[PDB]
Design a protein around this ligand. Structure first.
Ligand SMILES: Cc1cc2nc3c(=O)[nH]c(=O)nc-3n(C[C@H](O)[C@H](O)[C@H](O)COP(=O)(O)O)c2cc1C
Ligand SMILES: [Cl-]
Length: 381
C-alpha cells in the first residue's frame, strides 16, 4: 500500500506504478551506435518500472560525447531501438526515449570530420574527456552561428520522427546536466548577444524552439523535459538560478507537456554531493500544474514521502534500478536491495548490466523470452 506502487494515469498511458527508471548512460551500443539484443534484455528486465526513460541518445554524431552511446539518427539505429521497444511492450512496459545533444561536453575525436564540439559560446568546460585514444583535455568548443540553431532544432525534429518510428511511447528532451540545451539556459556558459543570449527569455528560446519542433511529431502530452535547476556538474553556473528556472518552469506549465522531470540539487550528474539549495522539487511544485517527476538520491522512504506529501507525482530512481530490475517488487516486499556497482556503470558487457538478480526467477525468464523473441522478429536480414 505504498503510494510508490499505485498505478498512475499519464494522460492515457496507464503506468503500473509511480516509479520511473531514470535515464542512465551505459555505453553498451553495438557498432554504428545501434542498440542490440543485450540492450533489449536490459530494458525488458526493467519493464516493471511504471515508466522507463532511456539512456541519453544522441540526435546526431555532433551531439555525441562518450563512447558507444546509442543514436537515433539512422535507419539501422531505429531498427535496433524497435527491438528494445518491442521487448518492453511485450512485458507491458512504457518507454520514452531521451533525446541528447552533448554540446561542448565532447571531443573532436567523436565529431564528424574532426570538427570541434559546438556550444552557445566558445568556453571549454574544465577537466578531461574520455576518447577512443584515452583521456584528453577538453577543447574550446565552436560557438554556433545564429543560423545553425535552427539546424540543430531540425535534428531534434528528425530524432523525434525516428523515435516515433522506432516504437517509443514518448520522448524526453534532455535539458540538464551541462549539455547543449543547459549550456544555452545558463549565463555562465551562454555569453551570446543574438536572440539566443542575454535575457532569461532569450536564453530559454532554444528550448522552446526544440519543443515546438518535436511537438509537430508527437502530441505535447507525450513530450517530457528534464532540467537540473541547481548543479555544478560539467562547469555549469548561472547568476540567478531562481529567476531563470522560475521563468522556465512557468512557461513550460503552459505547454501541456507529458511531464516536467527535475533533478534534486543533491546530485552532481552521476554522484551524490553535499549541496545547499532551495531549488528542489518543493520549490517548483507550485509553479508547474502538470505531471512532475522528481529524481535524485531517493530511497524507498524518501520517495514515498514525496508522493504522500504531494510534492511530486512520480519518483525516478537511477542507481537502484541499475542494480534492482524489480525495484518496485522489492519495495513492496520490504526485500533487501542489490548493491549497485559503480565500476560497471559505463561500458562493458552483461556484467553489472543484465546479471543483477530478481526476487522471482520467472521475471528474469520472461524478460529473456521477450528479448529473444524481439530479436528474432526485428533482426536485420
Ligand atoms: C551511470 C549513470 C548514468 C546516467 N546517465 C544519465 C543520462 O543518460 N541522462 C540523464 O539525464 N541523467 C543520467 N544520469 C543521472 C540519473 O538519471 C539520475 O538523475 C542520478 O543517477 C541520480 O538518481 P539516483 O540517486 O536515483 O541514482 C546518470 C546517472 C548515472 C549514475
Ligand atoms: Cl546526464
Amino acid at each position: 500500500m505504498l503510494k510508490l506502487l499505485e498505478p498512475f494515469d499519464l494522460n492515457g498511458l496507464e503506468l503500473a506504478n509511480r516509479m520511473v527508471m531514470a535515464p542512465l548512460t551505459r555505453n553498451r551500443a553495438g557498432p554504428r551506435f545501434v542498440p542490440t539484443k543485450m540492450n533489449a534484455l536490459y530494458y525488458a528486465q526493467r519493464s516493471g518500472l511504471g515508466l522507463i526513460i532511456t539512456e541519453a541518445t544522441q540526435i546526431s554524431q555532433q551531439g555525441m560525447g562518450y563512447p558507444d552511446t546509442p543514436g537515433i539518427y539512422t535507419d539501422e539505429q531505429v531498427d535496433g531501438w524497435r527491438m528494445v521497444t518491442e521487448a518492453v511492450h511485450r512485458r507491458e512496459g512504457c518507454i520514452f526515449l531521451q533525446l541528447w545533444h552533448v554540446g561542448r561536453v565532447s571531443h573532436s575525436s567523436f565529431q564528424p570530420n574532426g570538427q570541434l564540439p559546438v556550444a552557445p559560446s566558445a568556453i571549454a568546460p574544465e577537466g578531461e574527456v574520455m576518447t577512443y585514444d584515452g583521456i584528453k583535455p577538453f577543447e574550446t568548443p565552436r560557438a554556433l552561428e545564429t543560423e545553425e540553431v535552427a539546424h540543430i532544432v531540425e535534428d531534434y525534429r528528425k530524432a523525434a520522427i525516428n523515435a516515433k518510428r522506432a516504437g517509443f511511447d514518448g520522448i524526453e528532451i534532455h535539458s540538464a546536466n551541462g549539455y547543449l540545451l543547459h549550456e544555452f539556459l545558463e549565463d555562465g556558459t551562454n555569453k551570446r548577444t543574438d536572440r539566443y543570449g542575454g535575457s532569461i527569455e532569450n536564453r530559454a528560446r532554444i528550448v522552446f524552439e526544440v519543443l515546438d519542433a518535436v511537438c509537430k511529431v508527437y502530441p505535447s502530452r507525450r513530450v517530457g523535459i528534464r532540467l537540473s535547476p541547481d548543479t555544478e556538474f560539467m562547469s555549469m553556473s548561472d547568476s540567478d538560478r531562481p529567476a531563470l528556472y522560475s521563468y522556465l518552469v512557468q512557461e513550460l506549465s503552459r505547454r501541456e507537456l507529458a511531464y516536467l522531470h527535475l533533478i534534486e540539487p543533491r546530485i552532481k550528474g552521476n554522484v551524490d554531493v553535499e549541496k545547499e539549495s532551495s531549488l528542489n522539487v518543493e520549490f517548483f511544485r507550485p509553479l508547474y500544474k502538470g505531471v512532475l517527476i522528481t529524481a535524485g538520491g531517493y530511497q524507498k522512504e524518501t520517495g514515498e514521502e514525496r508522493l504522500q506529501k504531494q510534492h511530486a507525482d512520480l519518483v525516478a530512481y537511477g542507481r537502484w534500478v541499475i542494480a534492482n530490475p524489480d525495484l518496485p517488487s522489492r519495495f513492496e516486499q520490504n526485500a533487501p536491495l542489490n548493491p549497485y556497482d559503480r565500476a560497471t556503470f559505463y561500458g562493458g558487457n552483461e556484467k553489472g548490466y543484465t546479471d543483477y538478480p530478481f526476487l522471482d526467477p520467472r521475471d528474469s525468464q520472461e524478460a529473456l523470452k521477450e528479448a529473444e523473441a524481439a530479436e528474432r522478429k526485428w533482426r536485420r536480414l
